[PDB]
Amino acid sequence: DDEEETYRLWKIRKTIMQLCHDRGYLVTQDELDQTLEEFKAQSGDKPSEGRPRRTDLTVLVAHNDDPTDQMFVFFPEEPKVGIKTIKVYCQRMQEENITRALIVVQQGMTPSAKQSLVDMAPKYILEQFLQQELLINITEHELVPEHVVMTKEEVTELLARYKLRENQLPRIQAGDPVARYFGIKRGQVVKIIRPSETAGRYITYRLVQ
Partner 1 sequence: GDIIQFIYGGDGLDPAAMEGKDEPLEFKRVLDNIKAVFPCPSEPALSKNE
Partner 2 sequence: MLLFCPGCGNGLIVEEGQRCHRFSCNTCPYVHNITRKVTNRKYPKLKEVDDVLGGAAAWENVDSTAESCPKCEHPRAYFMQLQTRSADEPMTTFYKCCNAQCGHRWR
The least distance separating partner 2 from the CB of residue 142, rounded to whole angstroms, comes to 12
The least distance separating partner 1 from the CB of residue 160, rounded to whole angstroms, comes to 15
Q: How far apart are CA 55 and CA 137, in angstroms?
A: 18
Determine the 3-state secondary structure of 147 from DSSP.
strand
Which range binds partner 2 by CB under 8 A, 1-9, 20-28, 126-134, 141-149?
Answer: 1-9
Choose among partner 1, partner 2, none what residue 7 binds, the Cβ cut-off being 5 to 8 Å by kind.
Answer: partner 2
Q: Which is nearer to partner 2, 5 or 69 (CB)?
A: 5
Residues 166-205 that bind partner 1 (CB under 8 A): 167-170, 194, 196, 202-205
List the x/- string, 2-31, binding to partner 2 by CB under 8 A: -xx--x------------------------
Strand extents, DSSP E, the chain: 61-62, 66-70, 72-74, 80-81, 100-105, 108-109, 125-130, 146-150, 171-172, 189-195, 201-208
The least distance separating partner 2 from the CB of residue 1, rounded to whole angstroms, comes to 6
By CB under 8 A, residue 121 contacts partner 1: no
Phi, psi of 208 (to 5 degrees): -75, 115
Per DSSP, 126 falls in state E
Phi, psi of 139 (to 5 degrees): -65, -20
